[PDB]
Amino acid sequence: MMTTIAFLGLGNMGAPMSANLVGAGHVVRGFDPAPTAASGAAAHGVAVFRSAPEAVAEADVVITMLPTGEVVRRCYTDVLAAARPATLFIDSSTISVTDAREVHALAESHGMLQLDAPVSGGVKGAAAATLAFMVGGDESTLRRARPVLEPMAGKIIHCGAAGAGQAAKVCNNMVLAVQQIAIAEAFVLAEKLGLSAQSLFDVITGATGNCWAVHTNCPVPGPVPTSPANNDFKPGFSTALMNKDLGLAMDAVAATGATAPLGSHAADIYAKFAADHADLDFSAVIHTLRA
Amino acid sequence: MTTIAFLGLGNMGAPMSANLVGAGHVVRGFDPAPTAASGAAAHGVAVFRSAPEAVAEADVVITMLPTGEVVRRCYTDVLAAARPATLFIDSSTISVTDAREVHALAESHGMLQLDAPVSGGVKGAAAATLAFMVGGDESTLRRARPVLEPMAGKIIHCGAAGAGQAAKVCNNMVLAVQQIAIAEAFVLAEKLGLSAQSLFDVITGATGNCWAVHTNCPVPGPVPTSPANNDFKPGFSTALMNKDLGLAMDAVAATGATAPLGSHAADIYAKFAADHADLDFSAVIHTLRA
Numbered sequence: 001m002m003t004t005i006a007f008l009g010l011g012n013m014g015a016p017m018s019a020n021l022v023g024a025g026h027v028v029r030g031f032d033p034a035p036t037a038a039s040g041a042a043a044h045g046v047a048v049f050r051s052a053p054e055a056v057a058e059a060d061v062v063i064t065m066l067p068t069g070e071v072v073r074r075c076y077t078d079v080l081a082a083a084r085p086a087t088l089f090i091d092s093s094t095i096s097v098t099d100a101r102e103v104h105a106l107a108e109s110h111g112m113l114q115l116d117a118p119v120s121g122g123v124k125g126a127a128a129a130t131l132a133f134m135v136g137g138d139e140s141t142l143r144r145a146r147p148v149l150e151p152m153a154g155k156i157i158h159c160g161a162a163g164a165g166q167a168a169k170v171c172n173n174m175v176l177a178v179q180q181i182a183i184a185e186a187f188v189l190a191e192k193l194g195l196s197a198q199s200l201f202d203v204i205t206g207a208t209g210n211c212w213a214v215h216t217n218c219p220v221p222g223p224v225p226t227s228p229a230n231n232d233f234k235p236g237f238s239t240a241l242m243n244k245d246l247g248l249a250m251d252a253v254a255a256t257g258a259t260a261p262l263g264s265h266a267a268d269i270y271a272k273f274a275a276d277h278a279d280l281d282f283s284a285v286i287h288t289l290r291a
Numbered sequence: 292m293t294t295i296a297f298l299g300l301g302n303m304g305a306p307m308s309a310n311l312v313g314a315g316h317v318v319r320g321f322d323p324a325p326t327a328a329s330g331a332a333a334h335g336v337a338v339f340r341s342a343p344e345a346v347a348e349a350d351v352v353i354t355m356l357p358t359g360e361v362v363r364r365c366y367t368d369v370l371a372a373a374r375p376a377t378l379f380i381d382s383s384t385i386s387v388t389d390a391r392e393v394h395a396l397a398e399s400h401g402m403l404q405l406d407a408p409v410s411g412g413v414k415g416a417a418a419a420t421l422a423f424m425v426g427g428d429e430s431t432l433r434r435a436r437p438v439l440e441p442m443a444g445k446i447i448h449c450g451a452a453g454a455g456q457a458a459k460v461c462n463n464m465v466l467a468v469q470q471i472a473i474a475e476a477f478v479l480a481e482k483l484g485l486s487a488q489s490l491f492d493v494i495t496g497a498t499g500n501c502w503a504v505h506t507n508c509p510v511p512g513p514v515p516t517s518p519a520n521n522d523f524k525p526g527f528s529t530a531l532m533n534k535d536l537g538l539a540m541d542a543v544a545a546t547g548a549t550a551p552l553g554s555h556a557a558d559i560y561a562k563f564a565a566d567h568a569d570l571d572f573s574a575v576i577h578t579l580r581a
């Protein structure tokens with residue numbers, strides 16, 4: 001299983017992910033253009049390089065954890081020629097399904113194996129190695145990748161061909177967004193009807209409406225003391241991050257001509273909420289329903 | 292032996308009253324439809340020509356009626372015929388406003404009263420697995436418990452009068468939103484080239500999981516028992532979901548609440564019910580391009 005891994009993107013996700021790879025005994029060759037990110041990763045054993053091409057030159061596997069499809073595209077353009085032939089590229093960035101398929105084809109045109117493997121779990125999942133990887137690409141390529149993913153992962157799920165990882169994540173998170181708004185509406189309506197928060201909680205969680213947005217992320221303080229509502233709506237899952245994912249869902253809706261009325265409505269709601277509350281947990285959208 | 296007047300012997304009322312007979316109660320009935328009455332009499336209910344007659348000898352009076360207006364008119368018709376401290380249980384699904392009005396009216400005559408609307412449908416009614424969501428006094432629920440038990444899989448005290456109705460309407464508004472949201476996810480997935488089984492496996496193991504997908508999956512295959520595999524036979528009909536959402540919209544209006552997605556869901560299902568009232572509510576997956 002021991003492998004030389006180039007890790008491009010050493011931010012809030014990339015840094016802890018890379019540390020777990022070092023802990024598992026891999027040689028990790030890192031690059032990030034932010035020197036503070038690079039320094040922090042070096043402190044936990046990443047060999048940091050001056051450029052992304054240098055980092056990938058001697059690597060069996062190249063992982064990208066980057067903010068957008070544009071940055072992934074630009075990164076692949078900078079490094080693919082530098083990589084040894086038939087190197088495994090894993091993009092664990094969260095990007096559009098369109099961009100994922102573009103960068104996948106580019107990697108394959110350079111003779112590289114490529115997977116999309118975006119993750120859920122956030123920074124906390126990243127530190128604890130409990131992230132869920134949602135993978136698109138060839139099954140044999142995933143087989144080759146498993147030893148590298150396992151030390152970062154709680155779950156690895158194969159979603160289909162290239163882009164299917166991005167697709168699965170973005171579909172789930174659109175539903176989540178809609179559910180978190182709907183649970184918030186339910187709690188505020190209950191409050192105006194004189195139905196207690198604890199009572200509504202007990203019913204919804206015992207009934208057909210139950211979902212993570214209530215049972216774990218309860219947007220009123222009290223029924224779930226661990227939920228962000230009890231900690232000033234500190235993330236958790238920030239509004240900024242949810243808004244990014246909803247943007248990607250709206251990109252997917254636009255590329256496909258799909259009709260997603262509530263998903264699109266939830267996107268508009270989170271886009272407005274992100275303008276001034278980007279730093280709050282996405283459950284804090286409940287504030288928009290009170291007045 | 293507690294004697295129970297059951298007013299409303301329709302699709303729900305008939306099987307509920309059969310379970311009460313089966314539990315050893317004396318059941319007195321009224322319904323304006325001769326077929327409903329006859330069918331109930333056939334399983335042991337002593338049917339009377341008028342609601343006031345049914346109520347005369349009753350320790351408990353149960354209503355299962357279509358609207359608040361009918362519930363209200365039934366109460367003013369029968370309250371004077373009832374014995375003092377009779378226990379009235381309305382298991383109709385009506386507005387929280389109407390529920391609290393009829394509760395107040397009944398207690399004004401020295402009656403004890405609960406709202407106890409139900410989830411489970413006709414299937415649940417027959418099988419005695421209904422979920423009663425109850426508003427009223429804890430001590431009144433305790434007295435009612437022996438009567439509710441033979442009809443029920445769950446009995447949940449929701450709070451003071453009207454809280455049963457509120458709890459049910461709030462859950463069903465969330466459910467409608469979830470059922471549409473899951474449908475959108477499956478349609479988007481298909482157009483992205485992500486298989487239904489793959490999306491199913493991901494969502495059910497992730498934060499988006501809910502009954503609308505894990506049990507009511509609106510595409511055939513991943514859950515062989517879901518209505519999608521059986522021509523969208525209810526299940527839970529669009530007609531009934533539409534009725535609940537209408538009540539949610541009455542509650543949103545009465546309170547001045549902000550419920551944008553619930554309201555959007557209500558609009559979608561009202562429109563869908565014009566064409567497909569008889570299909571399971573999960574069938575909404577095929578009306579999104581309208």
Ligand SMILES: C[C@@H](CCC(=O)O)C(=O)O
Nearest residue numbers: 129150151153154155156
């Ligand atoms: C074994 C596991 C990866 C290892 C971990 O739990 O960190 C998996 O996702 O299959």
Ligand SMILES: C[C@@H](CCC(=O)O)C(=O)O
Nearest residue numbers: 440441442443444445446
């Ligand atoms: C609903 C009740 C069970 C009564 C019964 O159905 O026999 C309970 O479990 O609380």
